[PDB]
C-alpha cells in the first residue's frame, strides 16, 4: 500500500582507497591523495608520472586540469572552513 512522505533510509560506508587509473588497492602503499576531491592516484599512473609520494599537499590532474581553465559558470564566493575545537579559550 502507501505510507505518505518517504525517503529517509540511505546508509553507506567506504573506508578504502582505489586508484583512478588502474583500479588497484595493494598499491595503496604509494597512493596519493588529492586536496580537492580526495581521490587515489599512484605515482606510475599519472602523466607525467612521479618518482614517489609527495611531501606537502598534492593534487590530481582531474582537478587541476578542470580549475586551470573552466567556462563562465564558476564565479562567486569561496568556501568557509568550519570552526576549530581546541577546548580552552584564552590563556592565563
Ligand atoms: Zn594506479
Ligand atoms: Zn582531485
Swiss-Prot record:
Give the protein family.
Belongs to the JARID1 histone demethylase family.
Expression by tissue, per the entry, reads: Expression is highly down-regulated in metastatic prostate tumors.
Cell location? Nucleus
In the UniProt entry for this protein, what further remark is given in the free-text comments?
A: Involved in sensitivity to docetaxel.
Q: What is this protein called?
A: Lysine-specific demethylase 5D
Residue numbers bearing the Phosphoserine modification: 9
**Where do the coiled-coil regions begin and end?**
none
Q: What is known of its domains?
A: The JmjC domain is required for enzymatic activity.
Subunit structure, interactors included: Interacts with PCGF6, MSH5, ZMYND8, AR.
- In the complete protein, the residues contained here run 306 to 384 of 1539
Zn finger limits (PHD-type)? 18-64
Q: What does this protein do?
A: Histone demethylase that specifically demethylates 'Lys-4' of histone H3, thereby playing a central role in histone code. Does not demethylate histone H3 'Lys-9', H3 'Lys-27', H3 'Lys-36', H3 'Lys-79' or H4 'Lys-20'. Demethylates trimethylated and dimethylated but not monomethylated H3 'Lys-4'. May play a role in spermatogenesis. Involved in transcriptional repression of diverse metastasis-associated genes; in this function seems to cooperate with ZMYND8. Suppresses prostate cancer cell invasion.
- The highest taxon in the source lineage is Eukaryota
The chain's disulfide connectivity reads: none
Amino acid at each position: 500500500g502507501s505510507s505518505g512522505s518517504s525517503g529517509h533510509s540511505s546508509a553507506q560506508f567506504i573506508d578504502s582507497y582505489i586508484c583512478q587509473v588502474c583500479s588497484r588497492g595493494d598499491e595503496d602503499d604509494k597512493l596519493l591523495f588529492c586536496d580537492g576531491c580526495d581521490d587515489n592516484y599512484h605515482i606510475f599512473c599519472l602523466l607525467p608520472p612521479l618518482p614517489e609520494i609527495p611531501r606537502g599537499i598534492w593534487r590530481c590532474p582531474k582537478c587541476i586540469l578542470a580549475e586551470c581553465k573552466q567556462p563562465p559558470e564558476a564565479f562567486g564566493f569561496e568556501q568557509a572552513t568550519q570552526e576549530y575545537s581546541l577546548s580552552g579559550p584564552s590563556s592565563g
